[PDB]
Amino acid sequence: MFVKQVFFDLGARIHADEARALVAKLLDDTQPGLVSALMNYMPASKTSKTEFPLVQFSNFNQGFALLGFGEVGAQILSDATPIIHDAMAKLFASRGQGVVVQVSSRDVPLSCEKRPYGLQYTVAKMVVQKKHEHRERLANPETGKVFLEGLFLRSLERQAAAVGMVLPRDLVVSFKGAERVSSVKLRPDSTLAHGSLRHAVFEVNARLGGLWSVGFLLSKGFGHINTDLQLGQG
Amino acid sequence: MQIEVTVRNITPIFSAAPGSNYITIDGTINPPPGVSRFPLVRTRMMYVAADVGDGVIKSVPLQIVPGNTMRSLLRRTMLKHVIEPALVEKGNKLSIGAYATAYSGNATGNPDGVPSSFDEIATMRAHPFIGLFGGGPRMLEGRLMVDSLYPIHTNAERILGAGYENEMMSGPITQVVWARRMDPILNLGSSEDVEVINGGAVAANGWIQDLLANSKANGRGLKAFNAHEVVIPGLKWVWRISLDRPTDAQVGLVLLALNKMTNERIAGGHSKDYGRFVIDGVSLNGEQVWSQSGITGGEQYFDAVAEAIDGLSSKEFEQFAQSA
RNA sequence: GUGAACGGUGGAGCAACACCUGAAGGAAGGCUUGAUGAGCGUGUUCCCCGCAUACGCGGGG
């Protein structure tokens, strides 16, 4: 259907994961349920849902963005936006002279159709390795290629099924190469790190016309770029 | 008495045609719904029969400025720079009704049922301002016939039978001009900008939340996007001012209003500077009198309006306006 | 065999002449389409959820 993007500008850049931690810590004392809705927690406990995350935090050049997928996620952003804005307003008016926090909002529809020609789609900061078996596939290029193929495909089908629209199941993808390899830390000052690719290039015969998130740790703000912006653009 | 005021428009011309029209991002005026129509107020259009192909006359569009619009315009310049200076130099005081009837033809919305006595008709008809624009409670006939602004265009070849055969424009004469509204509190950026707002940054922030609550969800906020169709500038227009057995004072008044015609605007869209124009030529019964320094010629009309400005009292405007 | 049986209501004839809905009337007044999500930090085994039923697959932050 459609995905909503809401952009918040604090006057300074804040990373998506530490923005997620800050949003968790700011409204924790009061309004806990909205936090459960924002963070895709369980209704009863603190742990997160194993399904696709309807609400995922994202980069913004002056702060952080929120992405809500489907009618439910868009409604979550709709009920969450002013209380969240009011929290950063009181936090940034408590210290210093104060700053003014500016927003934007946009409702981008998602779409796809199959074309009989390959199309070049790049992604940046997408996590790929989570277990020791994923490390063992990544050592050899032949067995790592098909793993990345299946990962990119199953991410497309997962967020399709989650958004509630049908994808044609005859798509053939291909992976050309990635510019860099780097680690991703779940929490700072932790020894545990997870492998990730930088500026990976994929090639899909179909076209994609919305926000499409691929790979792991999607709610942390990794491996989504707008496919409308790359389209016919270099 | 026939006058033909041929002008060129310096700024573009927007005289808003009524009708909630709609526009897409690229053309398609009044599209089918669901293409995200934007509101569009087109310029005033007159349908006109024209020689489209050989032997066939069709009702085609041609964008005009209304004759009622510029009747009120000629009356307005007449009154602001000739009549009101006369009534200040002799100290004559108009009433509310006299003022409103001199500018609008009526003091109230109810015209009186009785007709005016013939001495009042003769005196008012003889008077230049009253004769040019009648009206009032007893519904006076005026001597002035103000025709609409046609451009010198192919759609008006049937209109311009005599004269204006050259200087003919073939293509369309309209351009869509897009104006957006922007919200300044979205665009302020800095708190050193908000130190002049009372309440500080938190008040501006709270207004951002009001507009966010409107963005999720009928009080109109800000930041609209609009288009308006405009007539393109630099094109020659023709004005027709006919007169009905005029006194020399009434023609002299028309020429007195006409000389300064340029200061004013033949349009709407005041702030966009729409309506600026320069008169290329003025012909009295076909004779050219227009120069760069106003009208050169018609000295008996100017002398008659000179002697008619003197001795012009408020009581003419008072008596005509007064309802029975 | 009806106090019955018979029997054309017909013809002629203009609803005509004369008469103006039309006089007065501003589509206006305000508004930056540029402003955008887009290119920049993490060096290794730790949590929880399903399918199984543990031989392992899938995934969450």
DSSP per position, B272-306: TTTT-EEEEEEEETTEE-EETTEE---HHHHHHHH
Say if the Cβ atoms of B208 and A81 lie within 8 Å.
no
| Widest distance between CA atoms in chain B | 73
Q: How far is CA B188 from CA A106, A202, B19, B196, in A?
A: 20, 40, 36, 12
Query: What is the C-alpha separation between B225 and A35, in angstroms, rounded?
Result: 35
Nucleotides of C under 7 A from a protein CB: 23-33, 36-50, 56-61
In chain B, residues preceding a discontinuity (C to N beyond 2.5 A) are 217
- In chain B, residues with a C-beta closer than 8 Å to the C-beta of A101 are 205, 208
Resolution stated for this PDB structure, in Å: 3.7
Say if the Cβ atoms of B216 and A103 lie within 8 Å.
no
Enter the tokens of residue B20.
């909630």
Q: How far is CA B168 from CA B156, B162, B191, in A?
A: 9, 14, 57
Q: Which of B183, B192, B209, B214 should we substitute to test contact with A (largest number of A Cβ atoms within 10 Å)? A: B209
Query: What is the C-alpha separation between A218 and A206, in angstroms, rounded?
Result: 22
Q: Are B235 and B173 in contact (CB under 8 A)?
A: yes
- In chain B, residues with a C-beta closer than 8 Å to the C-beta of A98 are 191, 200-202
Nearest-nucleotide field for B139 (CA, C1') = C24
Provide the CA A25 to C1' C19 distance, Å, integer.
Answer: 92
- Which residue's C-alpha is at the least distance from the C1' of C43? A183
Q: What is the chain B residue with the closest CA to A105?
A: B215
Work out the angle at residue B260's Cα, subtended by the Cα atoms of residues B258 and B266, and round it to the nearest 5 degrees: 75
User: A122, exposed or middle or buried, with CB in 10 Å at 0-12, 13-18, 19+?
Assistant: middle
Q: Are A49 and A40 in contact (CB under 8 A)?
A: yes
By DSSP bridging, strand B38-41 and strand B225-231 are: parallel
Nearest-nucleotide field for A56 (CA, C1') = C61
- In chain B, residues with a C-beta closer than 8 Å to the C-beta of A11 are 190
Provide the CA B69 to C1' C9 distance, Å, integer.
Answer: 73
Provide the CA B231 to C1' C60 distance, Å, integer.
Answer: 62
Give the N- to C-terminal CA distance of chain B in Å, as an integer. Answer: 33
Size of interface A-B (CB pairs under 8 A): 48
Question: Which residues on chain A place their C-beta less than 8 Å from a C-beta of chain B?
Answer: 11, 78-79, 81-82, 85-86, 89, 93, 97-103, 105
Contacts of B77 (CB under 8 A, 6+ apart): B257, B260, B261, B263, B264
